[PDB]
Amino acid sequence: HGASRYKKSRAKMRWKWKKKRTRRLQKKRRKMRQRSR
Amino acid sequence: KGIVVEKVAIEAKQPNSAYRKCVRVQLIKNGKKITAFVPGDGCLNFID
Amino acid sequence: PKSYRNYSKTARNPKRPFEKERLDQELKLIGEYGLKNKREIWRVQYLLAKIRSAARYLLTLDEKSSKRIFQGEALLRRMVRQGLLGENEEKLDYVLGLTLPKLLERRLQTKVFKLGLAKSVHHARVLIRQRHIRVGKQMVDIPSFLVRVDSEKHIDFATTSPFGGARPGRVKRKSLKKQKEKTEA
Amino acid sequence: GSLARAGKVKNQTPKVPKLDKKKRLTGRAKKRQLYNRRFSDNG
RNA sequence: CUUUUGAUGUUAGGGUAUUGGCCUAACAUGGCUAUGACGGGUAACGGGGAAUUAGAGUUCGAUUCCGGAGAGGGAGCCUGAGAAAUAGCUACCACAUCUAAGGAAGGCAGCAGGCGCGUAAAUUACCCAAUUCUAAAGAAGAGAGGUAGUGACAAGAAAUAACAAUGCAAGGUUUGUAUUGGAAUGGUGGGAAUUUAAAACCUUCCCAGAGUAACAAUUGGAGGGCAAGUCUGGUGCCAGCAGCCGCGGUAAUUCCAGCUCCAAUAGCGUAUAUUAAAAUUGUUGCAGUUAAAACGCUCGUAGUUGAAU
RNA sequence: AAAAACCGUAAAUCCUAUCUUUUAAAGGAAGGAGAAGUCGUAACAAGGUUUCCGUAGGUGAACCUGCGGAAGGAUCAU
């Protein structure tokens, strides 16, 4: 969403690592798209 | 309006405990599959 | 195609359906004016709100404004003609103070009960339904009839009513009595 | 796979009739009955 | 973006009923655009209007009237004052009728009606008497239009009783309340007057014609919101209920039933959409340290706003 | 009158291109919901290595580490 990421009051996954994992997934998806096209 | 495909029991949420008797309907307008809840106590066996 | 005959609502639903105090006062009003259903007093409030809105709008205008000296006088004369205002009234502020009982006083059943004729308000209602009463030269069987200050002087039994001088009584009972008398004699 | 219990309590409920009673009066007389039974007897 | 293929303009002409790039020829390079051009979407015909409205507003408007458009989809044309007409013609596409197989003939988004589609919508009725139009203009026609039929789309009025005596309760001989028991009256049936083009309806009059006035009112609820039961049986985390919070494992005020009660009432629920509620779209009138939300910072054009005299 | 030609109006069919909407699919990779499943203990206490940010690399997983920040810190303080 906006700039209220992290803010761990909910006791959830660390936002930094969630972002890193999402970025890894996006890199893999981009590679797959490039291979397909 | 739709055509009944088959009857199915569906779990209630965690705090509750029940097997709600719903039905699966193929609509006539588009042929879409939907799930519709059958109200009443014994009305499930009263539909074919 | 579509008919040009206008038509409109006469009552507004109350909203907040289960207000205890409002329900209790409505029951008071309908029980003590002998009316039949909760729609009737709602029509009465609808009407009263119409006159009240007219009066409020008029009072917003300044004095000596032709709109005021036209609409206000029309409204005042209409109200005093229906009998909701006395001769002691002269202003629109007095119009603004009209109340539900002051409007329900002019119902035909209320008026006939007040004048006598029927010894109960429900008796008055049923008589009006059985068309036994006249407002002078014309007989009306609508209990919600609103009388004007020139009508209460001539509310009385309909000439075609048994209590107005028509056919005396139960023809079945009278025929049975006369047949028995003739057979015995 | 438990649709065989539909209408369990509906079918297990004992059946009792609705008797006769008096005709329940309606209309303006119903309102008058509520009115006087609410405001007259109480004291 | 537009501009070869007219886009913007000039000149001359053609064409038209007339002006016009409407078209032609020559010439010029113009014309529109963040004040949103050009595109895309619309489950978009526009307006008079409708719902909701304290005031602002928000949503709707196929649909009485006005304007536009169309007659299966396109195009073309004759007559005519008036048509690019469609219950006029010509052709093509898609449908589709008769045929002796050679050939003919069609257009209900006019009124009825049928199929299909669907959650979703009426009679293959009567009449030109009213309104009005056309004519060779009282006198003929008119599915225009009017009348009736179906019609819980909506809207208005309004039955399902009322009254007297004891008995009972309440009160200093006043109210409510099971018995009796006579009046009133529609609903309904029949005849008539009337109405109507004819008929029907309404209205009115006369006969019959209510006591369990069987001439019987229902719908939805009774934990809270939210008016009304911790009454009685059944079930026992099952069945089920429940918009939300929740109820249900042996006392279930919530399920399934009976009784009672509540609300609305010839109406009452349900679904979807919409308005208020919503000052949760905030012009009036929101919020931005921490609840969602001040661009990392500064410059800066459009925009918005700008001392006094 | 047939018939023909030529400009014009131009239906319709076909080819090509583009756009719009719907839709199939081996495989891949997410999200949500369900159940008492397996593995660990990441966060909340100084959560037992303070937490978090941006970035980069690594690891079965939560996560770890480097650099520079913040206190929303466990310090408003010789």
From Swiss-Prot, chain D:
GO biological process: translation
Region annotated Disordered, chain positions: 1-43
GO cellular component entries: cytosolic small ribosomal subunit
Keyword ATP-binding tagged: no
Basic residues bias spans: 20-35
Main location: cytoplasm
Molecular function GO terms recorded: structural constituent of ribosome
Keywords: Cytoplasm, Ribonucleoprotein, Ribosomal protein
Annotated localization: Cytoplasm
Protein origin, superkingdom: Eukaryota
Assembly information from the UniProt record: Component of the small ribosomal subunit. Mature ribosomes consist of a small (40S) and a large (60S) subunit. The 40S subunit contains about 32 different proteins and 1 molecule of RNA (18S). The 60S subunit contains about 42 different proteins and 3 molecules of RNA (28S, 5.8S and 5S).
Free-text function comment from the UniProt entry: Component of the ribosome, a large ribonucleoprotein complex responsible for the synthesis of proteins in the cell. The small ribosomal subunit (SSU) binds messenger RNAs (mRNAs) and translates the encoded message by selecting cognate aminoacyl-transfer RNA (tRNA) molecules. The large subunit (LSU) contains the ribosomal catalytic site termed the peptidyl transferase center (PTC), which catalyzes the formation of peptide bonds, thereby polymerizing the amino acids delivered by tRNAs into a polypeptide chain.
Family indicated by similarity: Belongs to the eukaryotic ribosomal protein eS30 family.
Record's protein name: Small ribosomal subunit protein eS30
Naturally occurring in which organism (per UniProt): Plasmodium falciparum (isolate 3D7)
Name of the gene this protein is made from: RPS30
